[PDB]
Design an enzyme around this catalytic site. Sequence first.
Site, mmCIF file in Angstrom:
data_model
loop_
_atom_site.group_PDB
_atom_site.id
_atom_site.type_symbol
_atom_site.label_atom_id
_atom_site.label_comp_id
_atom_site.label_asym_id
_atom_site.label_seq_id
_atom_site.Cartn_x
_atom_site.Cartn_y
_atom_site.Cartn_z
ATOM 1 C CG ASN A 132 -2.719 65.101 -35.872
ATOM 2 O OD1 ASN A 132 -1.669 65.679 -35.580
ATOM 3 N ND2 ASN A 132 -3.835 65.318 -35.213
ATOM 4 C CG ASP A 174 4.544 63.460 -31.615
ATOM 5 O OD1 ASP A 174 4.616 64.015 -32.724
ATOM 6 O OD2 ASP A 174 4.880 64.019 -30.539
ATOM 7 C CG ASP A 224 -7.681 66.432 -32.921
ATOM 8 O OD1 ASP A 224 -8.925 66.296 -32.947
ATOM 9 O OD2 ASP A 224 -7.104 67.409 -33.412
ATOM 10 C CB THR A 283 -11.023 68.789 -34.681
ATOM 11 O OG1 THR A 283 -9.766 69.460 -34.645
ATOM 12 C CG2 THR A 283 -11.875 69.386 -35.783
ATOM 13 C CE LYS A 335 -6.027 68.442 -36.239
ATOM 14 N NZ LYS A 335 -6.407 69.727 -35.578
HETATM 15 C C1 LIG Z 1 4.599 72.240 -37.243
HETATM 16 C C2 LIG Z 1 4.398 70.819 -37.705
HETATM 17 C C3 LIG Z 1 3.030 70.304 -37.289
HETATM 18 C C4 LIG Z 1 4.650 70.763 -39.183
HETATM 19 C C5 LIG Z 1 4.335 69.382 -39.741
HETATM 20 N N1 LIG Z 1 4.955 69.148 -41.045
HETATM 21 C C6 LIG Z 1 6.072 68.332 -41.152
HETATM 22 N N2 LIG Z 1 6.409 67.552 -40.108
HETATM 23 C C7 LIG Z 1 7.375 66.637 -40.314
HETATM 24 N N3 LIG Z 1 7.704 65.785 -39.298
HETATM 25 C C8 LIG Z 1 7.208 65.744 -37.979
HETATM 26 C C9 LIG Z 1 6.655 64.596 -37.413
HETATM 27 C C10 LIG Z 1 6.097 64.675 -36.156
HETATM 28 F F1 LIG Z 1 5.509 63.580 -35.613
HETATM 29 C C11 LIG Z 1 6.083 65.849 -35.430
HETATM 30 O O1 LIG Z 1 5.368 65.916 -34.287
HETATM 31 C C12 LIG Z 1 6.702 66.943 -35.990
HETATM 32 F F2 LIG Z 1 6.838 68.042 -35.225
HETATM 33 C C13 LIG Z 1 7.242 66.928 -37.248
HETATM 34 N N4 LIG Z 1 8.039 66.440 -41.461
HETATM 35 C C14 LIG Z 1 7.711 67.252 -42.474
HETATM 36 C C15 LIG Z 1 6.751 68.253 -42.403
HETATM 37 N N5 LIG Z 1 6.459 69.232 -43.382
HETATM 38 C C16 LIG Z 1 7.405 69.451 -44.479
HETATM 39 C C17 LIG Z 1 5.335 70.034 -43.323
HETATM 40 O O2 LIG Z 1 5.131 70.934 -44.125
HETATM 41 C C18 LIG Z 1 4.330 69.798 -42.214
HETATM 42 C C19 LIG Z 1 3.154 68.994 -42.761
#
Ligand SMILES: CC(C)CCN1c2nc(Nc3cc(F)c(O)c(F)c3)ncc2N(C)C(=O)[C@H]1C
Length: 280
Positions: free
Chosen positions: A137, A150, A132, A158, A134
Amino acid sequence: KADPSQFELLKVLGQGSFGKVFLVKKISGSDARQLYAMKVLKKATLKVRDRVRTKMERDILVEVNHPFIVKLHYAFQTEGKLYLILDFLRGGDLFTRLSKEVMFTEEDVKFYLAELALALDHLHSLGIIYRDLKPENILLDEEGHIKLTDFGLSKCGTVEYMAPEVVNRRGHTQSADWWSFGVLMFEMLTGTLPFQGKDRKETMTMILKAKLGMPQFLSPEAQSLLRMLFKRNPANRLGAGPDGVEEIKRHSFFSTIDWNKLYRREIHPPFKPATFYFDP
Ligand SMILES: CC(C)CCN1c2nc(Nc3cc(F)c(O)c(F)c3)ncc2N(C)C(=O)[C@H]1C
């Protein structure tokens, strides 16, 4: 030796179909005081089929080692939970950036796509595809460089980013990733999806059958790359030929890119994430 009690929970970043993601701080060892994202999955919510998937997802992140793909630091389990300790990305995401700017300039898009092209080729060299692809990701780091998540790693989705062979359930190869890359390119430059219908069914019919109407504010070079990425036959698509990613890299659209400086993160990014006093 790694276990959950070695990680201080600061705040919960998000929750969904995957599980729950926390912002954690390592309490012990060499990497103590270091911030990470902790992805927790409850075993009760995972079925016999969902179990094999998560296994492969951990088995993929262990093999993956690239500056534009998220790093797995630790992975461990308990009686009812599965944990993945990954990079914490402050910079944000392309989804949030694009929805704010409406459309990116050719120079901005060229940077993000060049970084993504390297990350996708790395995945393909390992026999991995991105299910996916998009903007949700594609996260951004503190310096402004991309980090592919990942969630889409494999050996639902989507539909707007899906290739014809994927809409028609015929198989997801590395060529299907180069279509989604074109979809991503097009969306970044126009602020619009190339194939979009009144509903999901019409959109899917158009991915299969509709001729793409190319907006004419797109440079001759951007138009050439899109026409070449949007071939219905996957074997005719750019990236499917003899030199693979070198066909994408050598395209005139990317002629201003120094693929060596871009890999080493020597090229200044378009966005840089988060004075008055004077005396003679
Ligand atoms: C609920 C998930 C989708 C929230 C994703 N997200 C973040 N994710 C990560 N690292 C991260 C990397 C991954 F490969 C992964 O599978 C994961 F679980 C987390 N760092 C900072 C953020 N911050 C601050 C965010 O607001 C949003 C954009």
